[PDB]
Design a protein around this ligand. Structure first.
Ligand SMILES: O=c1ccn([C@@H]2O[C@H](COP(=O)(O)NP(=O)(O)OP(=O)(O)O)[C@@H](O)[C@H]2O)c(=O)[nH]1
Ligand SMILES: O=C(O)c1cn(CC2(n3ccc4cccnc43)CCCC2)cc(O)c1=O
Ligand SMILES: [Mg+2]
Ligand SMILES: [Mg+2]
Ligand SMILES: [Mg+2]
Ligand SMILES: [Mg+2]
Ligand SMILES: [Mg+2]
Lengths: 250, 743, 701
RNA sequence: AAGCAGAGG
RNA sequence: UAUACCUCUGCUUCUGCU
RNA sequence: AGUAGUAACAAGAG
């Protein structure tokens, strides 16, 4: 509909501080005021994860986990506790709640992982049906060239693919620019027909299309072929004194 | 037999076993306490290398400023900051003559990027000195406080959203004689802790309005707060770093943008290339200098450092370089790029937290700040601090130390690189017209300098010519850290060369471990670190398998997710064992769920959920990748309650954050952050792309939200997705919101 | 101008025009004719849009309905493009290349409105030349009264057009009576200046022969090079030079090691002198709990007696250490549970540093204190190299009869390079897992992990941490070893360099009287007697307990937990020395390296000379070097490594016949010997570099 | 596009 | 009153908890 | 005492 968000804006505009902020901050200055912090900053997250997993509740999740996950286990473990503020949007969670959800949570018949991360499943299918030749030992001459780690689309560049993604996922916030190419229009039409009634979040859809369409390049020492199906297995096929003969799938 | 590891260099060359010379498995040296002594050491060494200059009293800040430019020529090999401006202009003129069209193209790209840069680009920084709070804040917090004080005092060009209008507001704020800022004051009370029956001081942080004077505001706007660098390898003594305020960072960003555009097209620059591109550039330079020779031509390489690079650069030399590079450009561009050397020529250094003092008859300790250090008698300090204060006292201005020479640590990296590249460019053989010439590469203060000649006396004359020309421009080569050999072996920023670059695996050794985000990200980070070191840093395959095993060990001991058939007992053993028992295909369980490790060499580029997807139970993969995931964030469904489906697994959870200060109530200053987050969350309901891409616009947030609500209500009415009474109610709500912001 | 525009138009028109000029970068107090023209265009668009509704049927009712027109003019440009994009995505029209003024939902057309002072047909053809290629409806108004729509086809009613023409005619006649009409028809740059305070700042940022910033700017803009560098180099002294001193390692001296007292042991646990009470194949009532395994290991030693102080800690109170051990043994003998927290007695409060800090108060309350002195920052006292650290490094490179590193499972080997890597890793594991440095790795990892967990979970408790390792035999049997105990002090660690104090009590069979300079920080008691069954005889040796107060930090415990990276530092190097051979012989040289003990790499120094070893000896020596780098980590080691690497590269460049030269070798020797103070590992590495330099000099004769 | 982590100067 | 600047590499898309 | 090293921790702003 669209009435709940405007009534929430009505509720927030009654507060004088929120009204002053919403009337004195521009859309440009919202990027400044969004990253505003006040307390101390947590540095060295590796050591913090070393000692924090020994504590009882190292995980912070939303309040909806009080309705999806019970407070006790079969063994008697406390899975979640509330904070020191009655009515907060965050509770403190135990990793036993993660294990309880993985062993006894609600099973879903639909999953979105093979569709969103289809590039990694393409990599696994390329590796599984690959053919390994013999290892030959000789001094490798590795030239530090610029090769493609993501092929993208054959007709699009990086900025054209990003404009296609912005047109497909968020069409009402594309601004003044328009698709000034034929391949942009065809790929936009195809991805718009493929993404109708899609209950995936639009940021995950945009990053899936970014993995599919945007071409990425890196500077890597290359001893053999420079095709993108050989750049992804560069750790496997070459080293310093050896060369693994490998043909990918397809 | 006494065991000596260093006797392995009798058989192995040193570059082929250079990783044994890096003791990078222990903890790096950290600094304990203050960094005030290192700041005083920096100011004393900066005024000692420039001591034969002119002393001027500044008419705006009252600070004693030292001018060493065009001073006496150096008489010894000590470090000097007496750069001659005519030699600097001659080197920049020769750099322009050797590269026609370089300066004009760089200035045109800088002009094109000035018109497009916004204010929130200044949020790219880290800990920024906040002049409103007289302490370090994050860059967005300090920028928001600066913009709020500027709008409260009447400088509203930065409401246009461009960075250059904020810079105009910065330059116009210096005309204000009374700046009204909001500070953080502190109320203290003596309560009793119930856990230990001890009387403590409970601190309550509030907000307070105070008035700065003109000179105090100008001193705070030119203030670089100084800390000390921690976790620094390869040094015995510590040194001081510096962070500027928000009145300097925009001009410094524009000057560094211009100097980066210059450095991108110079073949003898080491900046801004890095990694394999920098190694390919060094190898190409070495091959061009070793191939282009005759039958009798000698070639020598200097591996060279510089003594006190930031102490001996000068902001007036940077001003002359900026005004010479931008020749023929519009004058507003020249003034805008000239601001930052002028601000660094009149800069001051915050000494820091002061020192800790101890009373043994009372058995107490107290941190005396730097602003209170001037009112202490000299007999209470130790000997080194007393000598430092006696050398410092004439440079003190309102708790800070005047520092007119020097540029401090890393403030103008690319411009100093341009200055060194000009001296490298002087040694072209079709211009020098002598029996020697030189080429090479420069990156900040590191340089690889290849002198080619016909005899060793020609090499000596070339080394002397380069050294004395560097001495003319304030570049002092480290005679105890530089060396020279024949061409074929050198060192450049810990990249060791021996007819090809060898590997240094120990430098990448702290990257091997558990990152500390959640259970999903750390597995991919560890496998990709192992794969990237196999590709780039010559990590052998057996040591790579050992790295996989050690990472799986560290990951299972960090997150307490050992395998289901193990005998270790943690807080997670019983639930992981329950999941292990009722699972038919146990090979599909993740390592965070107590499953086995699937990674060998061939599958390091494939994530763990995808690699185990064909081996999972349907129940386990339905629970693990459930779209009703309670551990992650769910975006609300837009107007096109009900939330979108989650994609990530349940191991992508969020770690609990702790931001509490001991015995400190911070709720008086933690409020506006929460109000800002509520305003951003209510903005995201009307603009669903604001998290994916940064939204732009000069209008306010409320006007944009009301206009978006009205046009979306009209589109939903003209499409059969909303009723006419719903449209009337949405428009009446928008009209009442517009009426509320005016009465 | 400005006053007439405010006297005529509504405040909504003035606010819209002010926001438009603020968006584009002008002001009504300066530009006045442009402000009046923008206000006129805004009022014409508002008169075109207002009082035009669409009811529930669909026809244009002119007066709860909806508007017929959507106003695009007057909004911010991103808001206007959002409206235009939403309209173009609702229907099927192509996007207009510029922002139009209105949108008609009835006609479904974008409307461009122009108000001109010239002629209507000329301005209409000009705007058609600007807006050609799209179906934007164009309507042009003028102050004369005439108009021209798109192809003379009108979509607005005659009454509204008559009102717009009447308003423009009245505005034109009021401009004629006001005398401002002559300036309207005639009107049909980035700046950045210095304010005077910053101008006076700019005048003081120059070379000292310049008084004004613009004078110096004109000097720099008009500069020509006329041999300034050559004249300044002819004018400069000849003492400023970079004279190359030729490098010859046969003529250079050795590193000057410091003098004074001998170096002292400063590790967090015992190394070569550590004794372990072991249980073989444990199966008690808590196989995994640390205190229960500690009690199971303590219940294998029956030779307990009354503890007597046989070696005093000279700076401390040794009766406190004796009472600490008495309290610890008594509390272990009556412990019930899975953990143990000691009572805060006076001797344990002395040993853990309870109350040694002065009370931190604010300076505002400490102004009247007449004896506030700064903290002294004295340099560390120099120490002489003693021979115990070479014995420690000799023992750490030796093979044991126990496997100390268990490795996790891998995936299955499919590629042949995975099988080659598995064979090489099996050789590395067979040569590196039975090393004494691996036992030191496991001890340090266990101690640092347990100390970090106890420091972050039990900040106020005096927790007892046993030193427990678990190893496999050469037959495959489990064995749990206890080395002693650690009593943690209070651990309210806020900074990363904040010290948690602990008391370490380690078992030993080594008499401290034979090497007392090694044990300045220790208070050694004699706690037992063990029947040592040797081969030739069987004696009864006294069991000592080395007790000392030590301290650690969170970053030190963090790097102690990650000592298995030492296994990555050694075995990456050795494999490279395999792979550099494998590129030459064009075959895998792992099995010729490990199965052919030819003694190929120099690693030793005997009285007979330089000793060689095999590749697994090199594995253990590099592992022990990485372990001792991790254990004795200091700033002295970092400075010494970074400064002696240059001298190593100079020696290598001499051996490569590359003719090395220096510019200040005396300063390099000063920078090396500045980092050799009192750490025994840095002293041992300096002696190792001196031995390597003497071996290089003996190799060239 | 941004944030975080690691390395180097 | 307390982890700066610049560059490179890698990962993630985070809704903020005394 | 101890950690440690140019200044701190050894609880009371990280
Ligand atoms: O961590 C760092 C290291 C280096 N730098 C910058 O890099 C420049 C040179 O880096 P440097 O390591 O050579 N330091 P330097 O000032 O020359 O003193 P020294 O060689 O010991 O006599 C320094 O002067 C800084 O400007 C940083 O900004 N941060
Ligand atoms: O902005 C538009 O779309 C637009 C601009 N003009 C040009 C003028 N004008 C009116 C508002 C405005 C805002 C910025 C720049 N010029 C503006 C008309 C009077 C003086 C200049 C004319 C139209 O007919 C338009 O539709
Ligand atoms: Mg240097
Ligand atoms: Mg350097
Ligand atoms: Mg318009
Ligand atoms: Mg118009
Ligand atoms: Mg002491």
């Amino acid at each position: 509909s669209g009435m709940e968000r405007i009534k929430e804006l009505m509720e927030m505009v009654k507060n004088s501080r929120m009204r002053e902020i919403l009337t004195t901050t521009s859309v440009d200055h919202m990027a400044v005021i969004k990253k505003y912090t006040s307390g101390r900053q947590e540095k060295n997250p590796a050591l913090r994860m070393k000692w924090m997993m020994a504590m009882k509740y190292p995980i912070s999740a939303s309040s909806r986990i009080r309705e999806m996950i019970p407070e006790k286990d079969e063994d008697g473990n406390t899975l979640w506790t509330n904070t020191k503020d009655a009515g907060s949007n965050r509770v403190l969670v135990s990793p036993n709640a993660v294990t309880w959800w993985n062993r006894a949570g609600p099973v879903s018949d639909v999953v979105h992982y093979p569709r969103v991360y289809k590039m990694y499943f393409d990599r696994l299918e390329r590796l599984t049906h690959g053919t390994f030749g013999p290892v030959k030992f000789y001094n490798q001459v590795k030239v530090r060239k610029r090769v493609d780690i993501n092929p993208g689309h054959k007709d699009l560049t990086s900025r054209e693919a990003q404009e296609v993604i912005m047109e497909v996922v968020f069409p009402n916030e594309v601004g003044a620019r328009t698709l000034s190419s034929d391949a942009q229009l065809t790929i936009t039409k195809e991805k718009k027909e493929e993404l109708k009634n899609c209950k995936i979040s639009p940021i995950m859809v945009a990053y899936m299309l970014e993995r599919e369409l945007v071409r990425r390049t890196r500077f890597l020492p290359i001893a053999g072929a420079t095709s993108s199906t050989y750049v992804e297995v560069l750790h496997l096929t070459q080293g310093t004194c050896w060369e693994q003969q490998y043909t990918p799938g397809g | 037999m006494d065991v000596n590891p260093m006797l392995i260099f009798l058989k192995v060359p040193v570059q082929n076993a250079i990783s044994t010379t890096f003791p990078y498995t222990g903890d790096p040296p950290y600094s304990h306490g203050t960094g005030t002594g290192y700041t005083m050491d920096t100011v004393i060494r900066t005024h000692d290398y420039s001591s034969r200059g002119i002393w001027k009293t500044n008419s705006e800040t009252g600070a004693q400023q030292l001018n060493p430019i065009d001073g006496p020529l150096p008489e010894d090999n000590e470090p000097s900051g007496y750069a001659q401006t005519d030699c600097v202009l001659e080197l920049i003129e020769g750099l322009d003559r050797s590269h026609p069209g370089l300066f004009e193209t760089a200035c045109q790209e800088t002009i094109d990027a000035i018109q497009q840069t916004r204010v929130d680009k200044l949020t790219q920084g880290r800990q920024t000195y906040d002049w409103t709070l007289n302490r370090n804040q994050p860059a967005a917090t300090a920028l928001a406080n600066t913009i709020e004080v500027f709008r409260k005092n009447g400088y509203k060009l930065n409401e246009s959203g461009r960075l250059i209008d904020f810079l105009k507001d910065v330059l116009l704020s210096f005309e204000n004689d009374s700046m009204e800022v909001t500070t953080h004051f502190q109320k203290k009370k003596r309560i009793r802790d119930n856990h230990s029956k001890k009387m403590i001081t409970q601190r309550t942080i509030g907000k307070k309005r105070v008035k700065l004077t003109k000179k105090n505001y100008l001193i705070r706007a030119l203030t670089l707060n100084t800390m000390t660098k921690d976790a620094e390898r390869g040094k015995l003594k510590r040194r001081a770093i510096a962070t500027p305020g928000m009145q300097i960072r925009g001009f410094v960003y524009f000057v560094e943008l211009l100097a980066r555009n210059i450095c991108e097209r110079l073949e003898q620059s080491g900046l801004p290339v890095g990694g394999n591109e920098k190694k390919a550039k060094l190898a190409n330079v070495i091959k061009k200098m070793m191939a282009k020779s005759t039958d009798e031509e000698l070639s020598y390489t200097i591996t060279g450092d510089n003594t006190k690079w930031n102490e001996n650069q000068n902001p007036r030399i940077f001003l002359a370089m900026v005004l010479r590079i931008t020749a023929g450009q519009p004058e507003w561009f020249r003034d805008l790029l000239a601001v930052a050397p002028i601000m660094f020529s009149n800069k001051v250094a915050r000494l820091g937290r002061g020192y800790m003092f101890e009373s043994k008859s009372m058995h107490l300790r107290t941190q005396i700040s730097a602003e209170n250090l001037s009112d202490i008698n000299l007999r209470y300090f130790n000997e080194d601090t007393k000598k430092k204060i006696e050398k410092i006292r004439h440079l003190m201005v309102e708790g800070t130390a005047s520092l007119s020479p020097g540029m401090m640590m890393g403030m103008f990296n690319m411009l100093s690189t341009v200055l060194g590249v000009s001296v490298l460019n002087l040694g072209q053989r079709e211009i020098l017209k002598r029996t020697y010439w030189w080429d090479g590469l420069q990156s900040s203060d590191d340089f690889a300098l290849i002198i080619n000649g016909h005899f060793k006396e020609d090499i000596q004359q070339g080394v002397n010519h380069f050294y004395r020309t560097c001495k003319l421009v304030g570049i002092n080569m480290s005679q105890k850290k530089s060396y020279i050999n024949k061409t074929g072996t050198f060192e450049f920023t810990s990249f060791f060369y021996r007819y090809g670059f060898v590997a240094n695996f120990s430098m990448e050794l702290p990257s091997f471990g558990v990152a500390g985000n959640n259970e999903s990200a750390d597995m991919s980070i560890g496998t990709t670190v192992i794969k990237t070191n196999m590709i780039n840093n010559d990590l052998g395959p057996a040591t790579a398998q050992m790295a996989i095993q050690l990472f799986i060990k560290d990951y299972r001991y960090t997150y307490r997710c050992h395998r289901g058939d193990t005998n270790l007992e943690t807080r997670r053993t019983k639930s992981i064992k329950r999941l292990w028992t009722e699972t038919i295909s146990k090979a599909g369980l993740l390592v965070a769920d107590g499953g086995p490790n699937p990674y060998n060499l061939r599958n390091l580029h494939i994530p763990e959920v995808c690699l185990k997807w064909s081996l999972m139970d349907p129940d386990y993969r339905g629970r693990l990748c459930n779209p009703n995931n309670p551990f992650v964030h769910h975006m609300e469904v837009e107007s096109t309650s009900l939330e979108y489906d989650a994609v990530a697994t349940t191991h992508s959870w969020t770690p609990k954050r702790n931001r509490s200060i001991l015995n400190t109530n911070q709720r008086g200053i933690l409020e506006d952050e929460r109000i800002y987050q509520k305003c951003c969350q209510v903005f995201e309901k009307f603009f669903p792309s604001s998290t994916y891409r940064r939204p732009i616009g000069m209008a306010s947030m409320l006007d944009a939200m009301l206009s978006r609500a009205r046009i979306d209500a009209r589109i939903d009415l003209e499409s059969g997705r909303i009723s006419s009474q719903d449209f009337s109610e949405i428009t009446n709500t928008c009209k009442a919101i517009e009426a509320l912001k005016r009465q | 101008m400005e006053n007439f525009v405010r006297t005529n138009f509504n405040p909504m028109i003035l606010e819209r025009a002010e926001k438009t000029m603020k968006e584009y970068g002008e002001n009504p107090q300066n530009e006045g004719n442009k402000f009046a023209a923008i206000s006129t265009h805004m009022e014409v668009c508002f008169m075109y849009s207002d009082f035009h509704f669409i009811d529930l049927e669909g026809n244009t009712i002119v007066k709860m309905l909806k508007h017929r027109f959507e106003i695009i003019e007057g909004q911010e440009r991103n808001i206007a493009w959002t409206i235009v994009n939403s309209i173009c995505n609702m229907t099927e029209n192509s996007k207009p290349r510029f922002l139009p003024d209105l949108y008609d939902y009835k006609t479904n057309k974008f409307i461009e409105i122009g108000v001109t002072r010239r002629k209507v047909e000329d301005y209409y053809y000009e705007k058609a030349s600007k807006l050609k290629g799209e179906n934007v409806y164009i309507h042009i108004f003028s102050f004369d009264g005439e108009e021209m729509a798109t192809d003379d086809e009108y979509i607005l009613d005659e009454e509204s057009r008559a009102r717009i023409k009447t308003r423009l005619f009245v505005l034109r006649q009021e401009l004629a009576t006001a005398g401002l009409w002559d300036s309207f028809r005639q009107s049909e740059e980035e700046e950045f200046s210095y304010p005077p305070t910053f101008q006076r700042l700019a005048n003081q940022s120059l070379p000292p022969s310049f008084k004004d910033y613009h004078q110096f700017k004109a000097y720099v803009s008009s500069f020509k090079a006329n041999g300034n560098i050559e004249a300044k180099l002819g004018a400069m002294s000849e003492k400023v030079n970079a004279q190359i001193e030729s490098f010859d390692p046969r003529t250079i001296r050795e590193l000057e090691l410091p003098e004074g007292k001998f170096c002292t042991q400063r590790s967090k646990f015992l190394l070569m002198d550590a004794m372990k009470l072991s249980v073989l194949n444990p199966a008690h009532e808590g196989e995994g709990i640390p205190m229960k395994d500690a009690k199971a290991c303590l219940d294998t030693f029956w030779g307990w007696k009354k503890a007597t102080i046989i070696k005093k800690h000279e700076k401390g109170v040794n009766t406190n250490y004796l009472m600490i051990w008495e309290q610890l043994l008594e509390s272990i003998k009556e412990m019930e549970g899975k953990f143990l927290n000691l009572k805060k007695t006076n001797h344990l409060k002395w040993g853990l540093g309870e109350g040694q800090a002065p009370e931190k108060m604010d300076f505002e309350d400490c102004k009247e204190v007449p004896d506030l002195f700064q903290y002294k920052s004295e340099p560390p006292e120099k120490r002489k190299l003693a021979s115990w650290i070479q014995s420690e490094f000799n023992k750490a490179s030796e093979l044991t009869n126990s496997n100390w590193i268990e490795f996790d499972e891998l995936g299955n080997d499919v590629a042949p390079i995975e099988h080659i890597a598995s064979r090489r890793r099996n050789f590395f594991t067979a040569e590196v897992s039975q090393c004494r440095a691996s036992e030191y790795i496991m001890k340090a990892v266990y101690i640092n992990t347990a100390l970090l967990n106890s420091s972050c979970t039990a900040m106020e408790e005096y927790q007892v941490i046993p030193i427990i390792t678990k190893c496999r035999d050469t037959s495959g049997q489990r064995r749990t070893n206890l080395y002693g105990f650690i009593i943690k002090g209070r651990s309210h660690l806020r900074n990363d360099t904040d010290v948690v104090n602990f008391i370490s009590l380690e078992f030993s069979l080594t008499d401290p009287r034979n090497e007392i300079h090694k044990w300045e920080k220790y208070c050694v008691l004699e706690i037992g007697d063990m029947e040592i069954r040797t081969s030739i005889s069987t004696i009864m040796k006294p069991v000592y307990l080395y007790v000392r107060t030590n301290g650690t930090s969170k970053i030190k415990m963090k790097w102690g937990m990650e000592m298995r990276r030492c296994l990555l530092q050694s075995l990456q190097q050795v494999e490279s020395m395999i792979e550099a051979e494998s590129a030459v012989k064009e075959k895998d040289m792992t099995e010729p390296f490990f199965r052919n003990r030819e003694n190929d790499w120099p690693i030793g120094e005997s009285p007979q000379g330089i000793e060689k070893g095999t590749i697994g000896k090199v594995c253990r020596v590099l592992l022990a070097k990485s372990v001792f780098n991790s254990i004795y980590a200091s700033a002295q080691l970092e400075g010494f490594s970074a400064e002696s690497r240059k001298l190593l590269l100079l020696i290598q460049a001499f051996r490569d016949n590359l003719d090395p030269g220096t510019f200040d070798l005396k300063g390099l020797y000063e920078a090396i010997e500045e980092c050799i103070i009192n750490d025994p590992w840095v002293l041992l590495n300096a002696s190792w570099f001196n031995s390597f330099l003497k071996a290089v000099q003996l190799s060239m004769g």
